[PDB]
Amino acid sequence: EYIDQGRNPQLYTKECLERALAKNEQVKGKIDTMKKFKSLLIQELSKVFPEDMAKYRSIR
Amino acid sequence: RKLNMSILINFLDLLDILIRSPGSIKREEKLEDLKLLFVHVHHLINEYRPHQARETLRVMMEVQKRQRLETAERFQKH
């Protein structure tokens, strides 16, 4: 179909590579926000529950 | 208190599942696991419900007794 449009199929290669990097960017970003949220949660729970988060950081 | 802290720590371990290996088998266990914990947190406090029931009878009786004596004293003054 891109040959029907008269372009290079190299453009289709570029677009498949770009969509691969787009999905990898989105997934790494979601995992990074989960990392920041876990860090914030353990900070605030260590503020409010000292001994329990101490034993959790011990056990890990 | 143990089940509260266990619920929070299993939520943190579910976050560790979602960080490390989302395709693991354990998350299904984990999405079952804290469910069982939540069931117990309800099942313990439902066991406060007969006790609360019995206890409200007790305080009702005390209030009942007090009101009788108050009316008695009120009437005697009159």
Add this chain to the structure above:
Amino acid sequence: LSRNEIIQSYLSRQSSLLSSSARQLHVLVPQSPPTDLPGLTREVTQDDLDRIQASQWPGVNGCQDTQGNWYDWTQCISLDPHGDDGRLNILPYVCLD
């Protein structure tokens, strides 16, 4: 489910906080090895019933507190477990009538 937006997320915030909510907490209560029917097994006596009627018993007849104020079961307790202006309001345990 599909989309959460600033206004709707803030609606979730105020609804959840209005459902839920210097220390001013209750005085901690330890474990209790003497319990009356199973644990200590007191033959029905009289000091325990007089304590449950007249005196202050902090596990049975009420909830005690820091700053000293006693609250029995029919009252509502105002506390502040956080360092904020938001106050926890424990409702009464019995609610007579």
Add this chain to the structure above:
Amino acid sequence: GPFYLMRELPGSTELTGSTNLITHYNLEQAYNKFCDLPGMIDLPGSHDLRSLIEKPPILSSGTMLAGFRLHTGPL
């Protein structure tokens, strides 16, 4: 002591979506190259209806006898 229903977290860094999947999958140099073949083939030929019929056949998917039966005059 231990909390209820603690268990072992998975292996520290197995395959995730947080890695660079392309560089792990050996596809980096192709991207670094990449980031018309009608024109690149018109380097060879002249230019680049019935070609729509060519693309439609693409979307759908006795030589001596022909030279002997190809009789037609010049003018």
